[PDB]
Design a protein around this ligand. Structure first.
Ligand SMILES: CCCCCCCCCC(=O)O
Ligand SMILES: [Zn+2]
Length: 266
């Protein structure tokens, strides 16, 4: 088994699929977690990025990508799986064709806004990510690819998912999507896939308590993300446990994944 997990950001694969990854490794699978939006960023940073850096417990002008890459390596090391850090800039570092930042902070609004931009610029990014994923598929030769469902609709998650769908379709490798966590705790779960693709029936895994423990410990390696993920209740792991319990009231911990298959008449 050669399992390629494609994470949009430095944390998503561990949060959503860390128990699956750890179990795969223990079972003897060759596991590689490739993060798309791990590209190096350097000042000057936008006000919005500087705001995020502060929330992440860094100085505004710190090399946040470096800090997060080190966290990712620590977390994946904990799960005993390999990492690969991609070249694409997180949405907080990207610019529009016109020179404006992609993401902006709006005074008095907690949620960051995305500036409108061309259909072409979106298509081009997905195309580039798909190119890189096709190259990794050639290099790693996975028997299975898993990436995010993009529940929560983060643009980076949607770009990752779509590019993975295109690349795996072209290369004829099976693909599954994980339920994005913690997003799925506060979203409906329904997603809109690119034309021609649809989800098959869900699998809800049953993971041994040791795997849950190992996942949760790995999550804690993402120090920069903890305050943000824990919320005003300090209850990330409680919420993840409850979500798992909902989906398997007769079980222990688990993670929901769906196969992606071709739609009828496509
Ligand atoms: C426009 C939103 C800013 C992008 C922030 C990406 C940070 C990673 C957190 C996550 O993976 O969920
Ligand atoms: Zn993410």
């Amino acid at each position: 088994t050669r399992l390629l997990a494609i994470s949009p950001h430095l944390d998503d694969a561990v949060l959503s699929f860390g128990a699956g990854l750890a179990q795969a490794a223990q079972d003897g699978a060759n596991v590689l977690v490739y993060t798309v939006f791990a590209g190096a960023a350097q000042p000057p940073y936008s006000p919005a990025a500087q705001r995020m850096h502060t929330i992440w417990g860094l100085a505004p002008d710190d090399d946040a990508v470096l800090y997060r890459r080190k966290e990712d390596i620590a977390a994946l090391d904990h799960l005993r799986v390999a990492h690969r850090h991609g070249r694409f800039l997180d949405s907080i570092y990207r610019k529009l064709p016109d020179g404006r930042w992609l993401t902006a902070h709006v005074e008095g609004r907690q949620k960051l806004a995305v500036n409108d931009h061309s259909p072409d610029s979106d298509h081009d990014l997905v195309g580039e990510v798909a190119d890189d994923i096709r190259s990794i598929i050639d290099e790693f030769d996975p028997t299975l690819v898993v990436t995010c469902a993009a529940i929560g609709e983060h643009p980076d998650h949607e770009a990752t998912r779509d590019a993975a769908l295109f690349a795996t379709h072209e290369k004829n490798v099976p693909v599954r999507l994980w339920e994005d966590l913690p997003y799925a705790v506060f979203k409906s779960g329904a997603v809109e896939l690119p034309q021609g693709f649809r989800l098959g029936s869900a699998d809800v895994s049953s993971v041994k308590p040791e795997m849950r423990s190992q996942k949760f410990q790995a999550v804690e390696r993402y120090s920069s993300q903890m305050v943000l993920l824990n919320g005003s209740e300090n209850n990330l792991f409680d919420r993840l446990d409850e979500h798992a319990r909902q989906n398997a009231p007769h079980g222990g911990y688990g993670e929901t994944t769906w196969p992606v298959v071709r739609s009828d008449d496509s």
